[PDB]
Design a protein around this nucleic acid. Structure first.
Lengths: 46, 271
RNA sequence: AAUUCCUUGUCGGGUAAGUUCCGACCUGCACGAAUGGCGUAAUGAUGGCCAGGCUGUCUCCACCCGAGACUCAGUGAAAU
RNA sequence: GCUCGCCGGAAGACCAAGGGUUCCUGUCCAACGUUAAUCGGGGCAGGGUGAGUCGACCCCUAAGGCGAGGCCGAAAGGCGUAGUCGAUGGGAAACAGGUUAAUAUUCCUGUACUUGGUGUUACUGCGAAGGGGGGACGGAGAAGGCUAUGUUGGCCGGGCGACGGUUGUCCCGGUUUAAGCGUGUAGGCUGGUUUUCCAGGCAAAUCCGGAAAAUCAAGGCUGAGGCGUGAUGACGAGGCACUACGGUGCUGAAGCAACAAAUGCCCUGCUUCCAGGAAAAGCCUCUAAGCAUCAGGUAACAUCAAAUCGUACCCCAAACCGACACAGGUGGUCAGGUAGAGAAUACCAAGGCGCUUGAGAGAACUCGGGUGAAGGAACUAGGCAAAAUGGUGCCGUAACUUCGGGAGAAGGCACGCUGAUAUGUAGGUGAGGUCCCUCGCGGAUGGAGCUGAAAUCAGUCGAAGAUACCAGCUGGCUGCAACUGUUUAUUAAAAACACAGCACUGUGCAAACACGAAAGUGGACGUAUACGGUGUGACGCCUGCCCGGUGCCGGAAGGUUAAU
RNA sequence: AGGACCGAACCGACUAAUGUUGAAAAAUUAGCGGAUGACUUGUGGCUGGGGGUGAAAGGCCAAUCAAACCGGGAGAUAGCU
């Protein structure tokens, strides 16, 4: 049937994309916490 | 005139609308037109500001003049059209060198007559002069009571202003609201009445007829959830306590005027 | 009676019979004019009661067709 | 290889999102596809993604986001005027032939054109971040002129036949043709032509917005189709060349108008309507600035140049997503023949697939479909479920009613085929001649011709002719609810909710009111025929008393009385 | 002309049946129905935690919700287990 998440790299890159996160205090802090946990990707749209 | 629909299908018999066989039509004059945009009560600063608003079909704003600044030049009425922003309808005027303006409709529903403004102007509709000229006991139309706000009062369908008394530099005006006010006699007036006057006779007949104008259904405070209005859901047909605003405050019969700066101009107060 | 215990009140009508249906009544333990009152048609994802056609809902099922129950080979579980 | 079957508005064709080496040949078979596997979107290699014109970019910008100078805030953050992103909108540039194992509006061929420069030829005022016209916007209906689409005949090529018929009693298939460029016709809008004038369009204006004199009404703008030209090039059944009946080329018949026209055009039309329905730039035009045999503006041309993104493949699905090659979810464009009102529906067309477990069997029972005698709603809480009715021309119709409705009430006739009605009526379309002129894609008057419903009656035939698919159960009493609507994803759907209209209350507008720790915005660029608060519930007839309590108003003289 | 009668595309929940360790995170088969509207829809936005959204069920708010989800105070507290 239908899913609550449908595949879209346009809206993923708009909410969770690297520059989109960096352009906000809290998203830039999510990225700072990615670097604290050591996550190998900082974007999953590119 | 007003006309009533035939029972072609259910409920339609109730529909009554204002119709005028002399009322013109065309395209709006673009230099006095703006799209104006919907406001929807949804708020630039936070939560909603207004209630009972949502949707409604596209509309624009036709820019009407209440400043009447071009003095000593004759202007002619070119056409009178249906107006989407005020129930009085609005006329198109052409000045003697090529300028076009939108004006509040004078009475007569007719175009082709020429109008002027000054300290002395012809007795005919649309001509403007100061109230110090006239012997009182008549209709003054839209009045420049405060120069820094333009022509005030009587802007809706069939609205009128009566000039009651005079002495020296001042005159008194009585309004269909129940309020009566005092102004300087030098204040500009156009004299006579507003046209249409049938707008209050309209019967929508249909539950969708305000929906296309953006009017949202009204849900009762005593029916919606107890945290979402201070009254709260039943407890069927038992309202409980004294009526209040959605903001929890008593309102019925409690006067809210706090202005204090114009009360000296009000010579008889609305009851 | 969307308000009524004993109550299927009490009477009339429909019925082989009818706590249901239709119509009255007053003695509403407690309806009542905007916390509205009363009535009217098409109409209602509305509810109750009857008549006719049509019919496997039922007397009562009886036999078919396409797919599972079986079996053998291939690949071979889960809860416990 | 031969043969069979199913789907055929899909079980087909094209486009997109989203994914990502999936494409093709060349091999490999451990693991994968819950198998066999020699197959493969699997393993592992090798090859493949050719663009001035296609989708993006250009240039403008809606909703919205950001946001200077400025403001609000410890601050994260935010308001708002310029500015800047951003279309789902508005704005320059290619068609259809056949080629490769795999590519292509990307190649090669033919033909076309926009942008920019330079050269050729005639005419020439070009021009703001400003002024005018446009761009440019709703809902629906109805005239005119058509086109994809399709058959008959013409025309071409093929055939004439295993049992009988079939050389005029036909069968089979074709008859293809673009982008563009003229011609500028139908439809649409609109009066030409010279003269002069200007307290508006922020200055100027030759443009609009207006005025004045004269001459004359068909001058001008816009735009389907046809026709010609592009095009004797491409295509073509069918021939033929050669090594290779091995593929890879060459050649090539006929190539038309008669009628019906699609969901497509003229159409951003015309007409009508109340809910009165984006902006800007390119474009055209006005002038300022500036400028000169320039530059720019127009018609016709030759010749040179044309950055960058994207490009392999799949797709109502094994390449997206649903953990899976999962009975599921999913945007845009297309829908022929025969039948039929038809997009319903079947055989079919072009096209596709025959499955990522197979073999078999067959019992009580499980699931759906098929058959139904005599009885029939007895069953059941309930005709639920199921079956019957079912098409539309002509007939014939109650109560009640807001006169519209109820109503397709109820109750009836007819239906194939042929003949006779109308040897084919209605509906749509229509030559020449008469005609009016201006010449001419003439215009307009008309009715020889063309196409063509639905219907009737007789006679004969069947169980049955609305023959299949497709396709209304009928009548009556009655609580309650105006009607169309709203009501929670997978047990709680209506009488509850909303609505047309009714009342009370606050509001004179820098309203009252609200959100915003605000900057600000909404109220509303609405103004008392207008807005905020709360209840009522269309429509017709309608509205008793009580101000002690708890709220509110009028009075502020008196009392009570605080911080002070 | 139409908050009009039937009805494709389009939409969609009411009855019945199948499914229910499924193909399945809600489908399937048949029917009745919504289809110019108080409608529906392609594409991109905007509305947030006592806040949103609701012709208003405390329904919906990415399966969760008389108060979502994650991470922290938090190894809080339990005369009890």
């Amino acid at each position: 049937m239908k899913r609550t998440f449908q595949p879209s790299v346009l809206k993923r890159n708009r909410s969770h994309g690297f520059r989109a996160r960096m352009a906000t205090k809290n998203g830039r802090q999510v990225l700072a916490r990615r670097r604290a946990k050591g996550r190998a990707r900082l974007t999953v749209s590119k | 005139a007003v006309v009533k629909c035939k029972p072609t299908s259910p409920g339609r018999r109730h529909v009554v609308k204002v119709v005028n066989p002399e009322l013109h039509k065309g395209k709006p004059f673009a230099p006095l037109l703006e799209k104006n945009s919907k406001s929807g009560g949804r708020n630039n600063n936070g939560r909603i500001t207004t209630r009972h608003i949502g949707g409604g079909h596209k509309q624009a704003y036709r820019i009407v003049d209440f400043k009447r600044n071009k003095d000593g030049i004759p202007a002619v009425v070119e056409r009178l059209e249906y107006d989407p922003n005020r129930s009085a309808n609005i006329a198109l005027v052409l000045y003697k060198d090529g300028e076009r303006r939108y004006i509040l409709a004078p009475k007569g529903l007719k175009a082709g007559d020429q109008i002027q403004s000054g300290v002395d102007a012809a007795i005919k509709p649309g001509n403007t002069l100061p109230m110090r000229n006239i012997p009182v006991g008549s209709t003054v139309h839209n009045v420049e009571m405060k120069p820094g706000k333009g022509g005030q009062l009587a802007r809706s369908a069939g609205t009128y202003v009566q000039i009651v008394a005079r002495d020296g530099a001042y005159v008194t005006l009585r309004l269909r609201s129940g309020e009566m006010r005092k102004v300087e006699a030098d204040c500009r007036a156009t004299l006579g009445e507003v046209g249409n006057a049938e707008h209050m006779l309209r019967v929508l007949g249909k539950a969708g007829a305000a929906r296309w104008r953006g009017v949202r259904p009204t849900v009762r405070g005593t029916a919606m959830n107890p945290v979402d209005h201070p009254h709260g859901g039943g407890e069927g047909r038992n309202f409980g306590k004294h009526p209040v605003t959605p903001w929890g405050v008593q309102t019925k019969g409690k006067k809210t005027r706090s202005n204090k700066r114009t009360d000296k101009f009000i010579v008889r107060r609305r009851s």
